[PDB]
């Protein structure tokens, strides 16, 4: 019918519009967030196709090196660190903090502080 | 019914579903990014009603000890730390890492460790 046709057309417009609305806010909101966690925690967190987390420090000595954490994570479990070129360099640290203390946050924090100290004018 | 109307009904459903499926994906993903951010950095980043950032250590003495940051400028990547009840207890850490050195990373990093130190290991 003429009423049905026109009545339905509005639904499509609205839904299509919602899709556009949804994407814009979400894109904008997510981008702003990630900046906060970088600016704040001094780690950029990148998801890989494999849902593994790659962290690159703000104070990283080299652009190329970074850390990658992978999780079995069906649930919110604890991740296990996968070896990277950078990861080998910072031995001990891991022993002290991950192997022994078992706290990823302590490891990063320690690492972050360490990197800062190295960062020097000359 | 009408071939014209049928198309709209099918069109509508997909579009509703497309938004529908899309919203679901964020749920899984957003949580998955946060919990990773949380277990790794040892901080839960929440965005307030006033679009301020509220941080809470995985090692918090009591719950509701949080910290709040507000972006000074939307464009400018630097955030002021707002006074809060828990902020009072870290006069020291603030003095050293936030003004003397102007580094949230340093500041949080060094805090995460102090709080991690006060964990009854009984």
């Amino acid at each position: 019918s003429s009423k049905e046709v026109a009545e339905l057309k509005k639904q499509v417009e609205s839904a299509e519009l919602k899709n556009q609305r949804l994407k814009e806010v979400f894109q904008t909101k997510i981008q702003e967030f990630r900046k906060a966690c970088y600016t704040l925690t001094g780690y950029q967190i990148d998801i890989t196709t494999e849902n593994q987390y790659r962290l690159t420090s703000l104070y990283a000595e080299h652009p190329g090196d970074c850390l990658i954490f992978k999780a079995t994570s069906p649930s919110g479990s604890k991740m296990q660190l996968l070896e990277t070129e950078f990861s080998h360099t910072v031995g001990e640290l891991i022993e002290v903090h991950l192997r022994r203390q078992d706290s990823i946050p302590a490891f990063l924090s320690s690492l972050t502080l360490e990197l800062f100290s190295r960062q020097t004018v000359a | 019914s009408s071939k014209e109307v049928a198309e709209l009904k099918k069109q509508v459903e997909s579009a509703e579903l497309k938004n529908q499926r899309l919203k679901e994906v964020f749920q899984t993903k957003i949580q998955e990014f946060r919990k990773a951010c949380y277990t790794l950095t040892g901080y839960q980043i929440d965005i307030t009603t006033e679009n301020q950032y509220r941080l809470t250590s995985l090692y918090a003495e009591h719950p509701g000890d949080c910290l709040i940051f507000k972006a000074t400028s939307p464009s400018g990547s630097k955030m002021q730390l707002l006074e809060t009840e828990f902020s009072h207890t870290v006069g020291e850490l603030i003095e050293v890492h936030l003004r003397r050195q102007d580094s949230i990373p340093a500041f949080l990093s060094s805090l995460t460790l102090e709080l991690f130190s006060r964990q009854t290991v009984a």
Partner: peptide, 19 residues
């Protein structure tokens, strides 16, 4: 002011960034 879908959208996501 604020459009409806946007308002609707905004609330859904803002909820997704708490507890």
């Amino acid at each position: 002011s604020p459009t409806v879908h946007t308002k609707e959208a905004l609330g859904f996501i803002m909820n997704m960034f708490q507890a």
